Ligand binder design. Structure first.
Ligand SMILES: CCNc1nc(NC(C)C)nc(OC)n1
Ligand SMILES: [Zn+2]
Ligand SMILES: [Zn+2]
Lengths: 453, 453
């Protein structure tokens, strides 16, 4: 057993929203056994000094595109709207791949770096949505991301993605990226069989993740609806990015939500990325259907899209999680940092009603329990007996946090660095003193850097 | 002499916006001797390895309220409008002060912490506007802040502030903080005499900083305009916060700008904080007058105020700098971090015109050369021969910056941490390997923390 002793603040996000001061967390294998003051060290083989730290459930990034780690801070993509951006990303990746510079082996190392960054940022679970499958067969890109994740020990969901609707029939994408629906479906069956760990504390899970309504055939959505029910896995896609509604109207004469409903995706198996601009009238429908939403403040701002109606979602009882999206539209994997963006950027939308603004605790909740609920993980996102020992802690005693009165608010509103001090995943200590304990930081940086096209 | 050799990237912000790759910076005493490739280590007594770093001019925070470091992350002040905010801050400060908990000795140590954080964030010059002068006689609060700055070796401007218009006569300021105009003028003359270093590379400078049009008598603005001419010092105040226009109309029947023009402040001696909501038709007048503007994205968002027309200011040729404001409305002193906030938050105002969005380079210029210009420092903000050796460097080779293609954009758009690697002020190395060279960080944290009310 591992005991973390004397934590300055513990934020549980349990059913009573308990917080604790000068308290401990006891860990046994993959699970938390207790959270409380003065815990017994009866069967403890390692005690860790938590004094001066705040502990949270591990952050859960409910929407990544790991392969975009290779596409950060490209000058031509700095100030572009969505259409120019998407063309630029697809063209570059197709180009690099054609030149033998962007195969699964490269993606493995890009994923390794972004996932290691994730750990160092206090993120203990990542859900990646990979759609890049050039060629006549589905290559081992997902396997590569899973290999990277398992090597590091980070908890991992892979939402296999695609672009199955070609520009020829209304899609905004070139037929290079277009796979036949059956190829995608066949591949997903194999991935579930090979990799999916459905048991509590499972470390790898597969989800089914079409790129979206403007990008994938209705047939794929329906196939995935059937597959998700048959294999009890979850469903993920992009949702109400601006312009989606125009494309859905043109192709189908219905809204993106009506499309999802029609093809089996109005269900509690589903989590939806962005949800920036839904018709206000559909929000109660999202609630009744039990879909979950991941707030992605950084890309929404970066693309000029604006502010998703998160307060409205919370008012409606809709599950809200948080994510970063890929590093071509962020351009980092810093989830904690993005929370500050949301905390501040939402405010000018309601200048005279501060009670509507998202709070630090609401945001931290989204990034832990909310994201856990998005991923369908009742075993994560909460520091309590019986849940997974996924824990992230930050030091409170730096010169840049002097004068902080509330440590949880302080974690979002102050600081020069979002680097976690101590990070535990599945009961395994992976970060200590802001450094990886098992991963070779310098070698990983060197190896991945050598592979960036 | 000191040679920084082999910097991966150097951003000069010189008159041709030169950048250099794999280049050196040579320093002699307080000044830069040369910037370029393979510089001679002739009289060099020390060579610093710059490989893997990006170098910029030191960041210059053109608007601080250091004493607010003690008022961070207060739950009751997390989500409040300006009115409630001002109420909460003035009550706490006056209340702590009355109880002997907020004297110059406390402010000295709060300033010491925030200024040390500033150095660690790559900030080499700070302009503080101390707003708390309880009792008719302003204590040695300004002396306290200067003492802290000089102990640390950070370059420092102290804008002596005031609240000369009391509510006892149609003003908005409590009588506890209201000083007779001549008393303020006299304190200012005493400060210039004791502290002001007008020579190039001067490390302490005095500025004259009324709280604002709603808060100070016309006679003070005029007296200051006179002092500014007499002593070649600069003038600083708050400008076009929401509600100012109404307060100005109510008291004087004219706009805040019209009022400044009337009382001698429409000149190239002036820099103005926020400038969030000016009438568009006055912008050309700002340009003609030659006033400079400090953009403060964090408090503007935190208060729910929204987006200052920065693109318009740049279009008009108006000098634009950057600052954080005080830590009661931020709540950090992390200037680099705030640049990312600006980079993203401005975009949704112009969804379809990305050319209007502020670029990384425009924002970094604001935080260096722009801020130097605000402060009237032609000796700062540029990495070139003859300017001050104020330099801030960040490492580029961390796992969180793998895949970055343009290091300057990457400084804004990526990272778990804004901590600077190497910081030089006045030719003195003050931060190296992300650690203070001379300052005792642990002792400073302990001492200041003990004094937080
Ligand atoms: C195409 C629908 N949306 C979308 N897709 C991505 N990424 C992939 C191309 C990997 N990133 C964003 O960021 C906003 N939006
Ligand atoms: Zn996405
Ligand atoms: Zn201010």
């Amino acid at each position: 057993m591992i005991l973390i002793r004397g934590l300055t603040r513990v934020i549980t996000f349990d059913d009573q929203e308990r917080e604790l001061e000068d308290a401990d967390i006891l860990i046994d294998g993959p699970k938390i056994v207790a959270v409380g003051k003065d815990l017994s060290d009866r069967s403890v083989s390692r005690t860790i000094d938590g004094r001066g730290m705040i502990a949270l459930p591990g952050l859960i990034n409910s929407h990544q595109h790991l392969y975009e780690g290779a596409m950060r801070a490209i000058p031509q993509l700095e100030r572009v709207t969505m259409a120019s951006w998407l063309e630029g990303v697809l063209t570059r990746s197709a180009g690099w791949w054609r030149d033998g510079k962007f195969g699964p082996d490269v993606i493995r190392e890009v994923a390794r770096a972004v996932l290691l960054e994730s750990l160092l940022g206090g993120i203990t679970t990542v859900a990646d949505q990979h759609l890049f499958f050039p060629g006549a067969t589905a290559d081992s890109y997902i396997d590569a991301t899973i290999e990277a994740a398992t090597d590091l020990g980070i908890r991992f969901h892979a939402a296999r993605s695609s672009m199955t609707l070609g520009k020829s029939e209304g899609g905004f994408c070139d037929d290079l990226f277009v796979e036949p629906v059956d190829r995608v479906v066949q591949h997903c069956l194999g991935l579930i069989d090979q990799y999916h760990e459905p048991e509590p504390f499972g470390m790898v899970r597969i989800a089914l993740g079409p790129c979206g309504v403007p990008y994938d055939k209705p047939e794929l959505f329906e196939a995935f609806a059937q597959m998700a029910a048959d294999y009890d896995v979850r469903l993920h896609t992009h949702f109400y990015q601006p312009l989606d509604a125009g494309m859905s109207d043109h192709l189908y004469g219905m809204t993106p939500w009506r499309f999802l409903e029609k093809h089996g995706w109005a269900s509690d198996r589903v989590w939806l990325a962005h949800a920036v601009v839904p018709p206000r009238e559909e929000i109660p429908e999202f609630a009744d259907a039990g879909v979950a939403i991941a707030h992605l403040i950084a890309p929404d701002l970066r693309m000029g899209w604006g502010l998703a109606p998160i307060r409205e979602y919370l008012d409606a009882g809709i599950t809200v999680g948080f994510g970063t999206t890929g590093s071509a539209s962020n351009d980092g994997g810093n989830l904690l940092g993005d929370l500050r963006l949301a905390a501040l950027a939402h405010r000018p939308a309601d200048p005279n009603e501060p009670e509507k603004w998202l709070s630090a605790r609401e945001l931290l909740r989204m990034a832990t329990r909310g994201s856990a609920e998005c991923l369908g993980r009742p075993d994560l996102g909460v520091l309590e007996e019986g849940r997974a020992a996924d824990i992230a802690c930050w030091r409170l005693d730096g010169v840049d946090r002097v004068g902080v009165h509330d440590p949880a608010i302080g974690l979002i509103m102050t600081g020069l660095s979002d680097r976690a001090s101590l990070v535990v995943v599945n009961g395994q200590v992976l970060v200590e003193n802001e450094r990886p304990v098992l991963a070779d930081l310098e070698r990983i940086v060197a190896n991945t850097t050598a592979l960036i096209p």
